[PDB]
Design a binder for this molecule. Structure first.
Ligand SMILES: *[C@@H]1O[C@H](CO)[C@@H](O)[C@H](O)[C@H]1NC(C)=O
Lengths: 49, 49
């Protein structure tokens, strides 16, 4: 159940012969390419001096 | 006036109940065949409409 789109159909229907039609095998989602942690530019630095 | 069709919605647990949560995902598959049933129920509705 991982090499062909047909094989996932055979695997979801649990049959080796898949009848004519459209079958929702699985679901996909484009994954986060990266993480964007964003905050306001520093505005109140402390005067250690 | 007569209603005929309905909005062909389709849920996906592994994204609805929790997205980008693999620990929730395998916790879901511990529950079993609830969600393959729900997608089956809603695709049955969608084909019906
Ligand atoms: C003290 O002055 C020096 C001068 O080079 C500066 O580099 C340093 O950042 C200053 N430190 C503080 C805590 O103001």
């Amino acid at each position: 159940c991982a090499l062909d789109p047909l094989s996932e159909t055979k695997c979801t229907l649990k049959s080796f012969t898949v009848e004519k039609g459209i079958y929702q095998t699985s679901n996909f989602r484009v994954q986060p390419t990266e993480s964007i942690v964003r905050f306001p530019n520093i505005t109140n630095l402390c005067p250690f001096g | 006036i007569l209603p005929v069709s309905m909005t062909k919605t389709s849920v996906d647990c592994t994204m609805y109940i929790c997205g980008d949560s693999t620990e929730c995902s395998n916790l879901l598959l511990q529950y079993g065949s609830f969600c393959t049933q729900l997608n089956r129920a809603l695709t049955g509705i969608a084909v019906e409409q």
